[PDB]
Symmetry: C3
Subunit: 157 residues, 3 copies
């Protein structure tokens, strides 16, 4: 039994940097409006992992309106979701994340993102891929209004 | 042999509600312009299933311009595509769907979506995940101009 | 060991046609601004293949700012990436690509795209799916400002 999962998240720019993406603190000239980290890459990833296990998603698992969690960085949410996710018998296959942003430049940060993720999920660095791409100045992402990430996850049970 | 598939669909808001998403009748203040249901979640899913079997997509399989089908709800299209899809030897792995909409709220409807889908594909409820996410007021989806869904499917042959 | 991968690319319309998509020369009234082919479908696909192998992405592998490659069509980049990708022990599972464009019409070109891809990756035509979809006149893609593609890839090691 192998299980595929998809996640997608978005945040708007606002206030002052830096931002956190994939756990890394990246300097930039806005920060991200969010009730949390606003770490889009770990949000999308967490959702791909939950979706592959059919556990729903962050929003279900962790209500903005709910307890225990409202004081939360996205790396604890990820580690919590994974903790549930193994409790149903699952194990990691691989994981591939696509950050979609006009800036800032993600590339140099991209190794450190992967050690955070690989550590949080207990796997090897090489079950984790991350890339970033622009939308060439089209779209809300191209106008620098915010930042999207998609992710995919393969779980083995 | 395992086979991965991706689908993506979009519809514009217009006219009066409710909408159908994932087979469920959801009350809302616009409805969806479409030559059909305008059920974005079953359209994207159907495409992820067809793509994983390399059968193309709805638009190929069922021309807006073509017969037998023009009088069609998206749940029959899904069941037809699946019917083809098993005829080439395939069997269901799992399926994860991401509705992207500012409103309405999908969450409460999300169990019933899954019994429709699981039934239509003949699997267990737990080979089916559905989530919805906002784009935080950016984008055509954030401006409430319409509604996008992505889906992924794993088939076993 | 099976490995899943995701890619996403975008290009803006500008200048005179035709465009190249999936290797095919498609007549149209704008062409695509790009430092290269501007073939969005092979870019997204190449990234899904690289991501599944955890090799990063085109942009890493082939700097716009870097050598050996600046004189490059997207079909050589694809064949190069695949060439790396097998060097780490990987083999093709399947591949499903979703072109997102208001025009031109991709459908008639879609067989020939698949023989290019299948050939470039050395597989059968039927490990390759391609579809195109519109965003119903919403979005930068619906306003005909440019052209997006997503892709997913399954690799066997
Ligand atoms: C999976 C994804 C990210 C698909 C395409 C994204 C898309 C068309 C986003 C909205 O663009 P937009 O916000 O430019 O529309 P608007 O023109 O209103 O800014
Ligand atoms: N926000 C972003 C978007 C893309 N990238 C990677 C990409 C280089 O890999 O930037 C170079 P590009 O301008 O050629 O896309 C990046 O590192 N950060
Ligand atoms: N249209 C949508 C969009 C998102 N959701 C789920 C999400 C709660 O899970 O809504 C809460 P959010 O406002 O915190 O995103 C939803 O249920 N319906
Ligand atoms: N640019 C595009 C977008 C979609 N398609 C396929 C689709 C028919 O399959 O066009 C018909 P549609 O207008 O019903 O979507 C296409 O062939 N080219
Ligand atoms: Na979110
Ligand atoms: Na949040
Ligand atoms: Na459609
Ligand atoms: Na339709
Ligand atoms: Na690009
Ligand atoms: Na390019
Ligand atoms: Zn988020
Ligand atoms: Zn549709
Ligand atoms: Zn490109």
């Amino acid at each position: 039994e192998m299980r595929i999962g998809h996640g997608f998240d978005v945040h708007a720019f606002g206030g002052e940097g830096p931002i956190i993406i994939g756990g890394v603190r990246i300097p930039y000239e806005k920060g991200l409006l969010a009730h949390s980290d606003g770490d889009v890459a770990l949000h999308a990833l967490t959702d791909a992992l939950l979706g592959a296990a059919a556990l729903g998603d962050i929003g279900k698992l962790f209500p903005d309106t709910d307890p225990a969690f409202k004081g939360a960085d996205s790396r604890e949410l990820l580690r919590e979701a994974w903790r549930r996710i193994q409790a149903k018998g699952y194990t990691l296959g691989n994981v591939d994340v696509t950050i979609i942003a006009q800036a800032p430049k993600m590339l140099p940060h991209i190794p450190q993102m992967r050690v955070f993720i690989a550590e949080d999920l207990g796997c090897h660095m090489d079950d984790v891929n991350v890339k970033a791409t622009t939308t060439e100045k089209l779209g809300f992402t191209g106008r620098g209004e915010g930042i999207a990430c998609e992710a995919v996850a393969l779980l083995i049970k």
